């Protein structure tokens, strides 16, 4: 009656549907009552400020619990031996067995071992005492306070920006490319050369000797005179020990391009030089778009001048399409962020840049799986907001004959081709897996279809991995690429070739016939998830089953049992199905990564290389073999430290099967069941006294599709996090 | 952007609408204390006021009392708190006997003789109950410590 | 649950409050709020 104050149509139904739909609709600011575009944008802006403060309070809490309850002082003595403590366990339910089991990593209290890798990150960026982390945590509390005050300030009518301020794409691109992506990268290169590189070489550069101690014995006058070679004078020698001065070198910017031979990570000077180059390129890229002064570009001119014969209108009227639509902007942002979160995951495991994080295996597994799951979620959200844009903000009159109109003008062709490629690739990946499985089971493993993944092996050979016998570009030192004949500027190449050809690191893993089939399974998952997502994006405006879906919106339940039956026709239901396929694909690739690295870390790579080509190899050497240490986390004899992970394993199974309840059984059964329960309550003595204000109804169709999806997701993630974190910590620390 | 208006739009009443006296948080919080909450019978608001003060008055004599350095540390605090709640309820009922003798309306159910008598009764029950429950937690402090830390679980 | 770290009484008081007082108070206020008027 009062709760969903943003929508009067929800403050009228006397059911529990208004509670559920108030919680769900609360952030869809476009559908609130009394909403103009200006109030939309200002409310969005202050919501962003609140969320920035959420992020800063979260990292403040991580810092404060590493500082207060963690063994950061002890861990930076020998990071290889001591496990990093995340925070302290305090619940009154623990028996004596659990308290003695969870006392670990040199503590008195029960503690949680940190698998987020924040210890390695804080140790690499130069933080070496609990007081430094406490100062960082209080500083981030103050920064979060500042952003909360900024959000409250920009809700004040004097400081509320106009619509022309929010619709200013060129100035925002200038200040984000230059001032946010370039100045922050420059400032990080400054922290690296002033604090992280010197304290990696031994000396303390705090806030007190910050100005008194130059990073280089040469001042900034060599930087101004152009003689920049002194900053790369003597690099860190290959016998350098992190945190102390043995063969330091005193070169703040070098480009060795290999790995540190002791921390197994990249050199901090190489990181600083990288961020300096990135800052220079991003700063000059932020001077591209027109602003109050005369020079620059206007994006409308750039877009509208790209008209070809094979598209016709080209990109005409795409500036107003992107600028006026917030779901287009959110789809582009989520697509790029999902791509670069995949990129973060794929590069932080093969090119680690933190001290001793390539030798702590559980945190590397947790970080990879975490960022690949975030990347899958963000990519699915990009396509979800593509569908929401096509429903809500898409104008087929202004977007006449441009690239968007021609996306929708042939959607059947590309949906049918995604159908063909996903069917083709799925038929033959399952065919090869079932063939290998059947002929291995029939006692004849020599009959397997084992395909050498020659293309990726050739890619590795082009990057310098000389194991496979190709001598093409960098594996052939006589070639034009390896010598770089005009200048011989390959300063990175000796270090890179020394790092790619060592069998220890995860940089360019050896790829065999078991990797071919899982890459094609991953391609199948990507293609089928993309098929469902674009089949919801392009059919959001209507198919022949329902030529008007733009008027029912994004997430209507169905269209009745007529027209044959119309159960999951909304674009939201294509989100739903592609959410399942995303979870499957990320399960496939994280299963593959996990088993490949359990082979690599243990040294017994033969297990993956012969047993990953058929499905019971995946089932008995990975799922069954590696859960042995998991389910024995608590047995009738006792309890060890992998007991909360066994409990989370079972917990995730339970959440998953409850998701099955919501996805399989549908609303009619539950509505008549609740009708019987309502009769029971209204007709019993002593409980007639208590009456509902909101009449109990079953969850809606789309609501319980969402709830089953949430259960499937949460149980799926909790089960796999428990398994992946207890299987590595079962056998690696 | 003025934050200090007059009270309730009346510029001649002797009150300002400052951010402490007449804010939204103050209206929703002061106006939802038991002394001001809407619809409550006087017995329940007196009971809720009473427990908040019986639980309070245990502490000052328990930690700072003539018995704070003996084995009957909590019994002296409880005895002092019962003395204070007794004289508090005697004062409350005397105030009810005095103020509400001339007949008045029923715009507020608390500002009447039956309403103030119910308030005093609820205050007595709540005050002595809160005093005894704070005594019971303080006397059995080893038990509460052990169950919050997990010495018996 | 002994606490070796600094201010071990602080989790002793903050686990009941975040476990009970924050949920009981938050659900009580939200129950008054979503059902008001």
């Amino acid at each position: 009656t009062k709760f969903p104050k943003f929508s009067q149509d929800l403050a009228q139904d006397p059911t529990t549907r208004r509670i559920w739909y108030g919680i769900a609709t609360a952030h869809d600011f476009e559908t609130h009552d009394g909403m103009t575009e200006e109030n939309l944008y200002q409310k969005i802006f202050a919501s962003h400020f609140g969320h920035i403060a959420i992020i800063f309070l979260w990292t403040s809490g991580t810092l404060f619990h590493v500082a207060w309850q963690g063994n950061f002082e002890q861990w930076i003595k020998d990071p290889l031996n001591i496990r990093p403590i995340a925070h302290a366990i305090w619940d009154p339910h623990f028996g004596e067995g659990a308290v003695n089991a969870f006392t670990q990593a040199g503590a008195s209290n029960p503690v949680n071992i940190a698998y987020s890798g924040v210890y390695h990150w804080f140790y690499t960026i130069g933080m070496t005492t609990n007081q430094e982390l406490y100062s960082g945590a209080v500083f981030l509390l103050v920064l979060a306070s500042l952003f909360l005050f900024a959000g409250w300030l920009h809700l004040q009518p004097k400081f509320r920006p106009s619509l022309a301020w929010f619709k200013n794409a060129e100035s925002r691109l200038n200040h984000h490319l230059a001032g946010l992506f370039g100045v922050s990268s420059l400032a990080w290169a400054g922290h690296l050369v002033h604090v992280a590189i010197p304290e990696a070489r031994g000396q303390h550069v705090g806030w007190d000797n910050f100005l008194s101690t130059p990073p280089h014995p040469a001042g900034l006058m060599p930087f101004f005179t152009g003689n920049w070679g002194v900053y790369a004078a003597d690099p860190d020698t290959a016998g350098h020990i992190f945190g102390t001065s043995e063969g330091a070198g005193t070169a703040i910017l070098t480009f060795l391009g290999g790995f540190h031979p002791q921390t197994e990570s990249l050199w901090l000077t190489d990181i600083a030089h990288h961020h300096l180059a990135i800052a220079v390129i991003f700063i000059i890229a932020g001077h591209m778009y027109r602003t109050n002064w005369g020079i620059g570009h206007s994006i409308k001119e750039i877009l509208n001048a790209h008209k070809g014969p094979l598209t016709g209108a080209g990109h005409t009227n795409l500036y107003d399409t992107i600028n006026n639509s917030l779901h287009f902007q959110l789809g582009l942002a989520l697509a790029s962020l999902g791509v670069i979160t995949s990129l973060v995951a794929q590069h932080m495991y093969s090119l680690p840049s933190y001290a001793f994080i390539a030798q702590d295996h559980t945190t590397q597994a947790a970080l990879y799986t975490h960022h690949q799951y975030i990347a899958g979620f963000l990519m699915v959200g990009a396509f979800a907001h593509g569908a929401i844009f096509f429903v809500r903000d898409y104008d087929p009159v202004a977007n006449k004959d441009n690239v968007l109109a021609r996306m929708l003008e042939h959607k059947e062709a590309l949906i049918s081709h995604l159908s063909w490629v996903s069917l083709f690739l799925g038929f033959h990946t399952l065919g090869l897996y079932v063939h290998n499985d059947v002929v291995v089971a029939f006692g004849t493993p020599e009959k397997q279809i084992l395909i050498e993944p020659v293309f990726a092996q050739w890619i590795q050979a082009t990057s310098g991995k000389a194991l496979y016998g190709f001598d093409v570009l960098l594996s052939n030192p006589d070639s034009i690429a390896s010598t770089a004949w005009p200048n011989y500027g390959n300063v990175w190449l000796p270090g890179w070739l020394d790092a790619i050809n060592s069998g220890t690191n995860s940089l360019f893993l050896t790829i065999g016939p078991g990797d071919f089939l899982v890459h094609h399974a991953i391609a199948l998952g990507l293609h089928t998830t993309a098929l469902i997502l674009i089949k919801g994006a392009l059919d959001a405006r209507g198919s022949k089953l329902m030529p008007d879906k733009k008027d029912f919106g994004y997430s209507f339940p169905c269209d009745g049992p007529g027209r044959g039956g119309t159960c999951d026709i909304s674009a939201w239901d294509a989100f739903y199905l592609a959410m399942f396929w995303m979870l499957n694909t990320l399960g496939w690739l994280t299963f593959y990564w996990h088993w490949k690295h359990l082979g690599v870390w243990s040294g017994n790579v033969a297990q993956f290389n012969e047993n990953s080509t058929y499905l019971m190899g995946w089932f008995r050497d990975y799922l069954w073999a590696n859960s042995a240490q998991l389910i024995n986390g608590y047995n009738p004899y006792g309890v060890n430290n992998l007991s909360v992970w066994a409990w989370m394993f079972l917990f995730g199974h339970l959440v998953w099967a409850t998701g099955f309840m919501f996805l399989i059984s549908w609303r009619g059964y539950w509505q008549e069941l609740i009708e019987t329960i309502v009769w029971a309550h209204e007709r019993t003595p002593l409980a007639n006294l208590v009456r509902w204000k909101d009449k109990p109804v079953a969850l809606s169709i789309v609501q319980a599709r969402l709830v089953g999806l949430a259960h499937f997701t949460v149980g799926y993630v909790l089960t796999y996090a428990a398994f992946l974190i207890a299987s590595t910590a079962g056998k690696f620390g | 952007n003025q934050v200090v208006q007059a009270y309730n739009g009346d510029p001649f009443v002797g009150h300002l609408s400052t951010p402490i006296s007449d804010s939204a948080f103050t209206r929703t919080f002061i106006g939802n204390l038991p002394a001001y909450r809407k619809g409550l019978s006087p017995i329940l608001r007196g009971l809720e006021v009473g427990m908040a003060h019986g639980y309070f008055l245990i502490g000052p004599w328990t930690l700072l009392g003539p018995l704070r350095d003996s084995e009957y540390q909590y019994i002296g605090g409880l005895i002092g708190a019962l003395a204070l709640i007794l004289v508090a309820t005697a004062a409350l009922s005397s105030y009810g006997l005095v103020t509400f003798q001339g007949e008045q309306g029923s715009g507020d159910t608390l500002q009447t003789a039956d309403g103030w008598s119910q308030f005093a009764a609820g205050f007595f029950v709540g005050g002595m109950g809160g005093a005894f429950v704070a005594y019971f937690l303080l006397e059995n402090l080893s038990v509460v410590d052990g169950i919050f830390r997990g010495l018996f679980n | 649950m002994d606490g070796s770290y600094a201010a071990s009484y602080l989790p002793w008081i903050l686990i009941p409050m975040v476990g009970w007082l924050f949920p009981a108070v938050t659900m009580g206020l939200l129950f008054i709020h979503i059902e008001s008027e």
Binding site: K43, A46, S47, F49, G50, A53, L57, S60, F64, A67, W68, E73, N130, Q131, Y134, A137, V138, L141, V142, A144, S145, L148, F149, G151, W152, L155, Q156 | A24, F25 | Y5, A6, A7, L10
Partner: peptide, 30 residues
Amino acid sequence: ALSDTQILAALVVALLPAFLAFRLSTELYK
């Protein structure tokens, strides 16, 4: 290690984001 009063100092500092978050969320509710 870390001090006893640094934790309480962090708590009374974080009382300021609490107040500002309460006031920002209240102002968003309008």
